[PDB]
Design a protein around this ligand. Structure first.
Ligand SMILES: CN1c2c(nc(N)[nH]c2=O)NC[C@@H]1CNc1ccc(C(=O)N[C@@H](CCC(=O)O)C(=O)O)cc1
Ligand SMILES: N[C@@H](CCS)C(=O)O
Length: 559
């Protein structure tokens, strides 16, 4: 009925009240069946629960479709009822809602992404796409992905939804434990930074914890996004009384927290498991009519994996090793679709100090795109760290960005209008940061020429509103080919002075020469002294890594 611009307008004018729990309510009516089944078996019960919230003052109610996706329904022998379950649910909610908003509610599948589970990004995507299709056809005022525990699964859900409709208001939620971490390790800042740049309309948190515990987690989230915010705490932490589980937080003790969420910029407030019509009735009285607060957001340059957020506020070691060039064993295995060998190189580099891993597949026309898609999804989970996607083919780049679990660093766009625009557009759609290589047709041979490319890059970047998502690579050329490293050091110092992060493919300096390690170490020390913020380098080089540590200690960047 209403599109995202209209819902956004309404939210900009007033904080809305969502509804309470459905799963924890159906039992009080004598129905302990799977919630989604009632949409067909006892639609009357679903209608009653929705009306109890509308009659309690809710401005928005959720469809009874939390577990209504093929992958989840298949687990209860209901996959073939997906269509009626979802169409009925929406209709029932629409009848109860009248003029109020109805959001299509979609929860996770219960299946972990490969390699923890067996599911690839593409299957999650199709799964969510089908449910969203039905909801959009039936006329929802928005889609909310509730209770997500993994960022890759949630990214597939939001991308599938946006692909079905560019006009539906989309809300993404993750649920966090007491330590402020989702199941696969994502903290609130990581969730915010990763998802703030995707085309969603709002971010939020629901379930797992009560209103008191969610407060600092919601605060962290609010500081890193300017999108609309939603929260639905459980009515206190669940405790056992007589074999069963109960949510003990009463209306008043729950309601008293509304003001504190209002202060942190909340736009929609509701409750999850344990919340009843009685809680909602009180929330309505306490919330009243309020205009949401403003906040903007903290700006940070960071990349992520499900469990790690790497901020560029210290020297970042980017492992160069997953790169087949000049590596017989590795290159052979890549063509054979060998995963564990790349996993071994990933883990070893991280053990040695790499905080991000560059990933390159050599002659891409010789590699299975399915293998790329699998490696990109896998390394962040098993190696734990973010990736620098060193990919040339633009179509292959889109595949890798789509399935990347977090916010990646995309390894380079040269300063060429067409290439940059093409890469900037893929990043805008799938999220991520970009390494911009300071060269074009030819390779610059001086500082002045590199500076010209820098300034041209800034022009093109300012034009596509992308100046805050790049790292500059001056372009290190072989010493044994008149690379003139001195001109690169000048360039690093100049870009650093301008406030931008920098990086270099360090080992290039010494290829062709003997004692590579010493030239590499010497250059890195000099570069770091000029402001170099990262480097694609060999973390397995003990001399290089030890001297790097000594360098950082000496310069007061650590001890
Ligand atoms: C040009 N480099 C580069 C980049 N990315 C950016 N942004 N900038 C760059 O300069 N990606 C690729 C490469 C950095 N990675 C690497 C990885 C391995 C070796 C290397 O020395 N490989 C072989 C030796 C090859 C030879 O002898 O010529 C090895 O296994 O030692 C060099 C650079
Ligand atoms: N909207 C769902 C949330 C389950 S975590 C329900 O209320 O059942």
């Amino acid at each position: 009925m209403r599109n995202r611009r209209e819902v956004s307008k309404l939210l900009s004018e007033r904080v809305l009240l969502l509804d309470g729990a459905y799963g924890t309510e159906f039992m009080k009516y004598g129905y302990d069946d799977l919630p989604e089944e009632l949409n067909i078996k006892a639609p009357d019960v679903v209608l009653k629960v929705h009306r109890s919230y509308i009659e309690s003052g809710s401005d928005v109610i959720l469809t009874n479709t939390f577990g209504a996706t093929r992958m989840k329904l298949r687990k209860h022998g209901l996959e073939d009822k997906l269509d009626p379950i979802v169409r009925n649910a929406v209709r029932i909610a629409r009848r109860a809602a009248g003029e109020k908003l109805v959001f299509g509610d979609i929860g996770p599948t219960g299946e972990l992404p490969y390699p923890l589970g067996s599911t690839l990004f593409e299957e999650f995507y199709e799964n969510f796409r089908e449910t969203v299709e039905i909801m959009v056809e039936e006329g929802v005022d928005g889609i909310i992905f509730e209770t997500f525990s993994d960022i890759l699964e949630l990214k597939a859900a939001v991308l599938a939804a946006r692909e079905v409709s560019r006009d539906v208001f989309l809300i993404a939620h993750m649920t966090f434990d007491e330590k402020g971490r989702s199941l696969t390790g994502t903290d609130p800042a990581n969730f915010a930074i990763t998802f703030d740049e995707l085309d969603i309309d709002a971010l939020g948190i629901n379930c797992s914890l009560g209103p008191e515990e969610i407060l600092p987690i919601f605060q962290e989230l609010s500081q890193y996004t300017d999108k609309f915010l939603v929260v639905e705490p459980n009515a206190g932490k669940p405790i056992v009384e007589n074999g069963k589980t109960v949510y003990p937080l009463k209306p008043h003790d729950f309601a008293v927290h509304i003001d504190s969420y209002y202060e942190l910029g909340v736009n929609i407030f509701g409750g999850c498991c344990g919340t009843t019509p009685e809680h909602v009735k009180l929330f309505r009285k306490v919330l009243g009519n309020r205009k949401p607060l403003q906040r903007k957001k903290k700006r940070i340059f960071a990349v992520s994996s499900p469990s790690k957020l790497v901020t560029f506020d210290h020297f970042v070691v980017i492992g160069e090793r997953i790169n087949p060039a000049g590596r017989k064993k590795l290159w052979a295995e890549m063509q054979k679709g060998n995963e564990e060998i790349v996993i071994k190189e990933a883990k070893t580099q991280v053990e040695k100090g790499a905080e991000v891993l560059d990933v390159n597949f050599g002659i891409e026309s010789q590699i299975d795109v399915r293998y790329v898609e699998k490696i990109v999804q896998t390394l962040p989970y098993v190696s734990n760290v973010p990736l620098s996607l060193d990919i040339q083919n633009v179509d292959l780049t889109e595949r890798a960005l789509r399935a990347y679990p977090g916010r990646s660093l995309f390894n380079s766009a040269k300063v060429d209008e067409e290439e940059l625009e093409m890469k900037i557009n893929l990043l805008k759609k799938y999220g991520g940061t970009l390494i911009v290589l300071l060269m074009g047709k030819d390779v610059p041979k001086s500082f002045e020429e590199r500076k010209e490319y820098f300034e041209k890059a800034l022009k093109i970047l300012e034009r596509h509103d992308f100046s805050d998502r790049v790292i500059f690579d001056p372009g290190v050329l072989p010493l044994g080919a008149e690379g003139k490293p001195v001109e690169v050091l000048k360039t690093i110092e100049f870009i650093s002075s301008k406030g931008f992060n920098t990086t270099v493919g360090l080992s290039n300096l010494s290829f062709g020469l003997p004692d590579r390690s010493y030239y590499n170490t010497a250059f890195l020390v000099l570069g770091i002294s000029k402001g170099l913020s990262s480097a694609i380098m060999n973390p397995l080089d003990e001399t290089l890594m030890k001297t790097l540590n000594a360098t950082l200690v000496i310069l007061e960047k650590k001890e």
